[PDB]
Every structure is written in structure tokens, then in C-alpha cells.
Symmetry: D2
């Protein structure tokens, strides 16, 4: 029900950074810098600007002290300065609230447009950014769990096909999705930069931010993050994983920051840059779709996500999903999942895999 | 209490091989050869003899066709031919049933002694064995999931302290254990070869065999086994993991063979060869003790294990544990576990970690 | 010297495949399939078509039996069917010989244009290709040394600035290069797909093909290839490496096929897709520019490369480089390199690093 | 020939630590702590005591300030206090200078015996040592290049068979060696703890210490050390590697400390604990014996080694090797190596492999 505008879409390069509001800046710094080893581009009493090992733009993450923890903006870099004008014209045509700042909303970004998008999400588009020392060969700084790139965002939204269509018009190409035999869509992944995704839609009450994902070079780097969290005795902040994804084929881990913002660590998905890249649809009941090894998806993964803010700094109202619930149809009392389609052996009914029930 | 014999203990080098009775030989071959990549030393219509990548003795695993799936023998290599005589005298003094075969019980083993030990387990002791091509540099054969060494056995027995004393007198040294503050021992690990263990005791109804473990070179090799099992659509045969252990500090995975014999894949524990190697005791309520990342221990891991045979080839009667159950005290309805000792935050009452309950 | 056409450049997606003429098809099959584990998309008595683990187009490599080993075509996929017409007009304006086949030059490719480009190289441009099973999750087929993508080509040409300009007009963006203070350019790297490169120019006598490069997931995959070649007693076919590159930051290995075609295995370079991606220029005397650890560059690496064919199947005549030779200025009798610029300690004069002279 | 004492050999557990005299304690600290990440057990302005990640004894390396860089002591831990008496009796019967100190020669070691051994080397034997925090699960401290264990020493001595016999009488078991077809032995490896070696003999002018080796968990940890040294622009202190060894099958790297003391980093050799462990002999001309991939051995690796001290703190006089030189017979002007025995193809005459001569 979101029409394709006459105005041309801005040419989006990739996800570039997220601005997260955090309640205790010191505790957040402890998590992102001391635990996760992100690199400080700038900090003061209000904000911490962080980047990954291979990044040359000013930052991939802004942490902003605020009264209520929430996503403040998810930023995409566009190809040219003129693409910021294109973004403004596009979202104006859609009837969305927009705000333009010629000198940026955060440090290290220039001319930028923020919008309350049709799904209620605060998107930023920008070209101009302050270049910093690209640390990609600074092996004197490299940590055993080094986060090397920002990879993607993931958004919770009640109507997946509605948001998918909107993002396709915006230029994202769908790479994978999860549906059932009766035509319900539960999740979709879509890209600009030639990886599996730059953002993704998870069916649920929204708008809420599901997670922000960073890449490592190798699988052992993700293992080290888990190991380090056990050593720091904060294993209760490991939410889910580590595992191999079905959708995306990436090795992964989900952890929780001090304000319960979910962060994914991700590596080794595949190239999607060709225009006829084959799309892959998984059945919702396929127990290898989210964790390839069949490990159960923790219930909080389906229920918990971050608030998002409007352009005034206020929390967006949550709209309830009316389509079927992935949690309910797979691990709920009347849910089921299979290892091999049509096989009772290795299937789970009314509970999760590996012998667990929902707590 | 099992008395310490006057006869000297045999000098045991290491665990060497296990003989498992299996019901369908071809199906077992698929698992151990096609899925796991173990190397065939010899096979016929009745048995398959298998060895790991770096082994020079004839085999690390014998699969024997039989009516009832069970452990037939856990075999330990001894230092000299004379240590077989020492083993016979020692077990005779213990009042155990023993059987001596100068030409072995299985192919590729010479003079051998099998015993029904004081815990009801069929142990074998041998020195003589047919050497085979050591494949340790045969990288033309090397699998992405290559199993490189046999590492240990793990035994389920109802009275851990009783068994621990007997194994210590036999010359095994305890490296780690799990106890509570009320005097109960739930598990013990013990070695000869200078890794964390060659065998271990897990509290539970017994005698039953908990598992046999093989090691890989690197953590990615264990990940590959998981990935391959996903590709073969047999993820339902992944029981638990992959993870990082607390006890042993090893990276691990538990999988189930066609007869539900449990196999662990293991890597990167530490050196224990010094005689004053510090013994580590974990509290049973410590949620980082079995999985360091705090992932829940699947209930089947605590309840399921293989039958074992006596020397007549009949299943040993099972004696029920009367000591407290690790399952019940940690993940049962009256259970408890913590992330940080003395912290209510990150503790679990009457359920498992990460949002699950007993299925 | 090469003027920019008024005709619009074809939109090039990425390098896609190379066709190499080989003298003994069975011996070449042994190397690419049995040693390297590439996947067969088609074969007969004259040709083998091969693809990497994550590929969905028909092939990344075609081996064609012929009398003289040579590069027959380096192919790039274009974005649309219409881009093939654009490519034809473009090279026609450049005065280049073109050949258009509506049904393709090799199996699994449709409408295609081959050209003898301004530097004498046989380029192919195509859109249409037969999709095949994408093996990216086929872990039951995954080799310990699995080649996962085709990454790039590398071309030897006598005048690097002349070639660079031509490739820039064609849409390729320079990411890194090697120069000296006197203004000679020795090599340049350039991309379309958002990695360090899709092709590269290496100063030397040309046209010759320096190498075709495939990527692995992890560094250990590359180490396995070396280990395997050791076990096969073909370590003499390991030309150079393994190492870490300075330029590109990739972990790497160079090996030689039966006809001495050079293959690079490559992993873990960085993202270059932003239009203002920072260009990196290294000094030719920096001993960390090619191997980051300062290991010496094998002289054959600088002197040997494959013949290339014209459109008639005849070898292209070679034109000698008149600019300074990288070998001569770094490892030759009158050459030098440094570890730290301006520091004589860790410098090498008239010989290579690590105590070696030219053989 | 060194006679076999009537007195029993001390039961040696393993190599335990080395004491190296260094000329600038601060510069050595930067190398061993800052670059390499070893853990400080104790330090003052005269000495730094260092241990590996998984160690529980007080230290694996003592750096002692002094006027001439040299080995002061190579220490082996013995099984019981009584074994220190046995070692004293054993070396006294050998006619060797001994010194016994009930309170140790260095901090954190108790009753200890130091000897000037028959080959001129300062050996220490001890049981008593101060236990420290075993850091094996301190992943909060874990470096991307983490050194996890002390693995072995390597000694340069002119007469290898002479030394080998002495070490065998002492209880070391030979695992691998290098010989030629004319009866010359160039090197031998021997163990107590069940890895390939605890010490080794390299033929050359001696006594000199060739190197001390530390283990990592995985091959990428060794890669990271190289990468870090490149980032620190100290790649000139990488002497040789990284590589795969033929002998030992271990992945390796050799680096040089501020006083040119050689340190090897080493991982993933095999189990040798069985008393009939198959002994492997390589031919000296086999180009895969030292580097399995055929990479050339740096001439400094054959010529350079550390001074060793006597018990009075004076440099031991060097005795020249009269047997053939491994350098000369393989990579010298009159040397030879092969890839495949008997095959001229892939062989090297009067030069090193991969296109190099000696600089
Ligand atoms: Ca209690
Ligand atoms: Cl997922
Ligand atoms: Cl466990
Ligand atoms: Cl290079
Ligand atoms: Cl060596
Ligand atoms: Mn994600
Ligand atoms: Mn185990
Ligand atoms: Mn290349
Ligand atoms: Mn060594």
C-alpha cells in the first residue's frame, strides 16, 4: 500500500552507521570498547563515536546518552551529494516527515537527510563524511575478536510484504526470505552492497530495531567473543548462538548491550551483486532455516527488540502484527518444525529442538 | 570402598580404542566413514576397524555387528607386555572376572586381558598391536572435519567418589571435578597421557557408556562437522553444542550414531602431565561449568547413555544413582544455576539458561 | 594514448570466468579437480568447465585442449543484455577487432562479445549464462582447501599508466598501486565489484596473463592447499607464499598448473564499493608492499607469465617493457628495499630479503 | 662416547623454562611482553619472569640483565623431589660440574641442580616451583597471537650421534632425525612429555642455543604474530617462515629477539607417548624435510645461534663441527636438494629452492 514514487530513488551504497541512545554512557563504552574492541573516532561526555577495523568513514556506531534507550537513526550512505536531494524528494513524495541538516546530525557527517519512513523507522541518508585512518592493517591493535565491518541492520515490522515492496522500490534486492505453504511471509533480507543484506525485515510488533550486525574475518573471532564474555563472567549477555545460519549461510552470534540493544556478530555470507542473483525461500517449519545445525531459537530473539525514536526524540508507537507468529508456529504449544520435510523423525511438536520447552 | 590392591597397577599409557556393538553395520559405516571420515584399517561382513588421522596402532574404534547395541570393551594401551600380566594380577586381587587371550579379542591386537571392572565396565588392557601407516601428513586424505586422535571415554556410574578412588589407585590422576557445597560429587575427569583425561566419571544410573571422544586440530574442524550434518539433513543427530567447555576448557560437539551411541568431538584442552597438576573443582550450580558460554545442557545429555556388556556378551544390570542428580539440581523444577556466584542477576531458578525449560 | 570513446561503457559487474588453453586435458583435470577441488559444470573430451563453491553462473573456469598453452579469454559479466551491444560499440570506436556470437563462444554462456583489447588481451563481455546449483551450503562436498569464489585476474602489460587510463574509462576504479619517487608506476589494482580488484596490471613484457585468482573462506584453507601439495610431492609447483600481501591486505598463495599457468589463492581483502574509497600508493622499495612479512618475491613471479591468444587462436606478440623493472630496482644487482623508510638497518642492497640472492 | 652411568636417570617430565641473559631489559620486555604478549609473573630492575597462557608453574622464561646475551640455563622439571638427588648422582658419575641450591637459582623455583652437561650446556633440574594463577581460561587477556605453552628447546652441537646417545641414556626418546646416505646425522629430535620433542640437536658449532619454542592453539595465531610484526614495521625480525615443518609436522615461525636470541612459535605436532612410537628418518637432501612446502631455509638459520654460559657465568668455548654442514650440502655452492627422490625435475643444484641463491 506504499506507492512507487515518480521521483527517482536515491542511489544507496550500503548501511553505514547506527545511532543508539544509551542510558549510561560509561557502561556502554565498557561494552563496545573494552569488551568488543571497537575503535574510538571521537568521544565526549554525551557521545561515543566508534568504528570497525577496516572502516575509513568517520564511524559505524554512535552512542548517545539519553533518557530512554532506543534507535535514534539507521544511516545509509548514498553514492553522490545529489543523492541526498533525491532522498528528500522521494520521501516528501511518499508523504513522510523529513529533516535536512546541511552540516549533519552527528559529528563526522556532512549534508544529511533524516526521515520518519513509511514503516515508522528513522532513516538517515548522507554522502559527506569525515575520512579517518583506515585501520585495516593495524595488526598491532587487532583483537582476538576483532570487529572488521558493519554489515547490516535488522528491523521488526508487522507486515513483511508491505515493507519489502517499499524497500524494493527504494532499490534493495531481496536475497532470501521465510514463508509458509499458506502464503504468510515471516522475514525478508535485502541488499544494496552485494552481500546477503544491508537491512532485513523480521515479522513482529513494530517499529522496533531487532539488531545491528558487525563482521569478523573468521569464525574463531566469533568464538573468542563468547570465550571472552565467559571470562568476564557476562555469559548471561550471550543471547543466542554461536551458530551457522540457514538463511544467509553466515556464522553468527547474538549478544546484548547494557540497554538490551541486540548486536550480531556475523561472517562469511556470499556474493549477491549480480542482478539475477537467485532468491532463496525457506519454509517457516524448516528447523535448519535460522540455525543450520537445528539448535533452538531462544524465545527472546522473537519477542525482544529496541524502541525507535521519531524526529522529535519520542518513542514510536508500536503496531501489532496480525499475521502468524514465527515463534508460535515453530516453537509454541501448537508449533512444529522438521529436520527433513515430511519426516516425523527429527521433527518437534509443541516445543523447540534439542529437548527444550519455552521457559 | 574398593580396596587398594597389594599387586602393582599396570602402567597405562592412554585410552586406545573402543569396541562398540552396532545393529546395522552398513548404517554405522555410513556414519563413521562417510559422515565422520574415519579411516578403515580393516572390514568384513561382521566388523569395521577404524582409526584417526594421526594414529599408528591398528585402530581406535571397532564396530561389531550384534543383536543389542552396547559397549563391548574400552581398551587402554599399557607400557610393556609385562603390564598385561600386572593387569591380570591386579584385577584378580580386586575380585573381578577376567579373561586372557594371548592372540587378542579383535584383529590387530595381540596378548590382551579383558575384565569386568568393580564398576561393571568391560575394560581391556593390551600392549601388542599391529602398526599401520601413520596418516598424520597425508593431507591428500585430510577432511575439512578430520578426526585426528582418540582422546577419551566417559562413563556413567552411580557413585562417583567410589569409582574415583579405584581409578586413582589404578594410576589415573583427577584433573577436574564438579561438586556442590554439601559433599556431593557429580563428575570427575582423570588422565594418564597428560591431557585433561583418558576417562571420566559422570554421575548417573550405571554402568553405561556416556561417550567416546575424538579430537580435531582446530575449532573450525568441529564447525565443519556441524555444517556437513546440516548439509546431509541429519542435524537431528547433533545432540549438544558446539560449545566451549568450562571443565577441560575444550571446544566440543556431541553427536549421536545410528544406535544412539554418543560421540564427542573435542579440541584444545591443556597439559596435565605434571604430578602436582592443580585439581580444579567447579560448583554444580555454576552455569559456566559445562558450557562456558552458559548455553543450556540438553536433558538427554544427563539421561541417555549406552548399555555395556559383560564378558559373556550380556548387558550389565544397571544400578540406580541415589546421590543428587545434576539435572535436577541445575535445570529441574527445583534447580538453580548462577552466572556470577552470589548474584541474583543472571541466575536461573527452576529452569535452564537462555529462556528454556525442560521439554 | 587510448582516447575515451563517446560511446557509453558497458556496465561491468565483475570478473566471471577465464578460458585457458591446456595441452593435456587429463593432467589439467587432475590439478584443477583432484588437487584443487573445483566443481564440474560440464565436461567432454575437449573441454572441462569448472566452478567455485559459491557460484551460481555456469562456470568460473573453462579448460580447452589446444596445441599451445595460453589465455584464450578473460570474461566479465555485464549488468544487462544491452550492455553487450554497448561493449561492441565501445570497442569498435576504439578500433579494436571484435567478434560477436549470439549463442556464445563456450557452453553455458549466451550472447557474448570477444575483443582484442587495446593492450592485446582477449576480453569477453556477456550477460546471459546458464544458472546451476549454487553449492554454497553443500558442506558434504566442502574440501579442506575449498575455493569459494573467482576473485580476479592479473595482466602483465608494459605501460601501466596507459592501461590504467583505459580501464578507468571502462569504469574500473583504482584501489592500490606501486610507484616510485621518480614517477614510474609498477603495478595498479582496479575494481568493479567492491573488492580490491577484478583485474590488475603488472608492469612487464606483455600482453601476458599473470594469474587467475580464487578465494577461500579462511587462511587455514590456503595452508591446506600447501599441505596437500606437500603430501602429493608437488611442492615444486608452489611458486610463492603463502603470505600476507601489503597491497590488498589479502592472505595469499601462488601455485603453477601443468602448463605453468599461475593460480593465486586469496582471502580477506577489504570493501572498496564507496566511490571515494581511499587509494593507496606504495613505494616500490618498501619490502612490505608485496609480502607484508618482508619475505622475498621469487624472481619467476616477476619474469614468468602465460601467453594470450588473439581472436584467430594465435599467440599475441609480446612488447617489451621500457619503464624500470620492479625486479631490477628491488632485488636485482643495482636494486634495494627497506623495512623502515630511511633506515639502513633492515634494508637490502643488491639482493633480496631474508639472506637470499637471485638464483 | 659418553658412558651410560650405573646411577639411574632422573625421571624428567618436560622442558619447563629457560633463563636468557639479555643486554637491555626494557627492550627485551617490549619484545616479549608488548609484541609477543607473554604474562609477567614477577619483575624488578634485574629480571623479568614470564609465563605462557596455560602455565601453572611460576614461569617459562626468565630474562636476566647481563653484559653478554647468552643462555644461562635450560631447565627441565623432574617428577619428584628425589629426582633432583638422582640428577646430582647421575651427572657426578658422568664427571660433570654440578651446583645444588636448596632454595633455587631463580625466583619461583625451589631445590634445584644446575650442571655443565657433557655437551657444554647449562641444564637445570628441579621439582619445587611456586604455583601461580593458571591463565588458560582468561580470555579477557587472550591475544590474537597468544603463546599457550613452552614446547621445546633446540641445541647446536658438533657431534649429533654423541649427544643423541647421552640424551637417550638420560631417558629422552628419539622421534625424528635427519641423516644422509653416507652415515652423517645432521639433526635429531627427542622427547619426554609425549610431543615430538622437549629438546633437539642441530649439527653445528657448539655449544650454542638454537632456539626456545612456544606453542599457539591454532595456525592463525602464528599468522597474526607475522601480521603484527609487519604493522610494527619490524618484519626484519621475522627470520624464517611461517611454514609447515616436514620433521614434526608442526606449523611454525622463527623470530629474533633484541639480542638475536631465536624464538620459534609452533603448533599441532603429534602424540609420541607410546614407547614404540615409530621413529622417522629424513634424508638431508629432501627439500620437504624442514619446510614441507619446499620453501628455502634461510642461511642464518644454519649459522646463527646463542652463546651459552657455564656455571661461573662465562661464555662456553665453541667447538667446531667436523661432520658435513647441512647448509653446505643442501643450499651451498656444491649443495643439492630434491622434491621427489630420484627425480631431476624439481631438484636444485648449488642453490636454494624457489629461485634463490645465498646472499
Ligand atoms: Ca547446596
Ligand atoms: Cl536467524
Ligand atoms: Cl560438559
Ligand atoms: Cl604481490
Ligand atoms: Cl626445520
Ligand atoms: Mn542479522
Ligand atoms: Mn567428554
Ligand atoms: Mn593477484
Ligand atoms: Mn624447533
Amino acid at each position: 500500500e506504499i506507492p512507487k514514487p515518480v521521483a527517482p530513488a536515491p542511489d544507496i551504497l550500503r548501511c553505514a552507521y547506527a545511532e543508539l541512545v544509551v542510558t549510561d554512557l560509561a557502561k556502554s563504552r565498557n561494552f563496545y570498547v573494552d569488551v568488543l574492541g571497537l575503535h574510538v573516532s571521537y568521544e565526549d561526555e554525551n557521545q561515543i563515536y566508534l568504528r570497525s577495523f577496516e572502516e575509513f568513514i568517520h564511524h559505524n556506531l554512535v552512542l548517545t546518552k539519553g533518557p530512554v534507550a532506543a534507535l535514534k537513526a539507521m544511516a545509509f550512505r548514498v553514492r553522490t551529494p545529489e543523492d541526498v536531494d533525491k532522498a528528500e524528494a522521494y520521501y516528501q513524495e511518499l508523504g513522510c516527515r523529513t529533516e535536512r541538516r546541511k552540516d549533519g546530525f552527528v559529528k563526522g557527517i556532512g549534508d544529511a537527510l533524516r526521515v520518519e519512513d513509511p514503516l515508522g523507522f528513522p532513516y538517515e541518508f548522507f554522502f559527506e563524511t569525515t575520512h579517518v585512518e583506515r585501520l585495516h592493517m593495524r595488526y598491532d591493535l587487532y583483537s582476538a575478536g576483532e570487529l572488521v565491518r558493519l554489515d547490516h541492520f535488522n528491523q521488526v515490522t508487522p507486515d513483511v510484504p508491505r515493507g519489502r515492496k517499499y524497500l524494493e522500490d527504494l532499490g534493495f534486492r531481496v536475497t532470501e526470505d521465510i514463508q509458509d505453504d499458506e502464503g504468510t511471509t515471516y522475514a525478508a533480507w535485502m541488499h544494496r552492497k552485494g552481500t546477503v543484506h544491508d537491512t532485513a525485515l523480521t515479522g513482529g510488533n513494530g517499529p522496533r530495531l531487532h539488531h545491528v550486525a558487525f563482521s569478523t574475518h573468521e569464525k574463531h573471532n566469533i568464538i573468542q567473543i563468547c570465550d571472552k564474555m565467559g571470562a568476564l563472567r557476562i555469559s548471561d549477555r550471550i543471547e543466542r548462538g554461536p551458530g551457522r545460519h540457514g538463511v544467509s549461510n553466515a556464522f553468527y552470534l547474538y549478544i546484548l548491550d547494557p540497554d538490551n540493544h541486540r548486536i550480531e556478530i556475523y561472517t562469511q555470507d556470499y556474493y549477491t551483486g549480480d542482478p539475477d542473483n537467485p532468491t532463496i525461500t525457506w519454509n517457516v517449519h524448516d528447523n535448519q532455516r535460522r540455525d543450520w545445525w537445528g539448535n533452538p531459537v531462544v524465545p527472546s530473539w522473537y519477542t525482544e527488540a529496541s524502541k525507535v525514536l521519531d524526529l522529535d526524540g519520542n518513542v514510536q508507537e508500536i503496531i501489532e502484527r496480525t499475521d502468524d507468529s514465527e515463534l508460535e508456529v515453530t516453537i509454541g504449544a501448537d508449533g512444529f518444525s522438521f529436520t527433513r520435510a515430511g519426516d516425523e523423525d527429527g521433527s518437534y511438536h509443541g516445543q523447540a529442538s534439542k529437548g527444550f520447552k519455552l521457559g
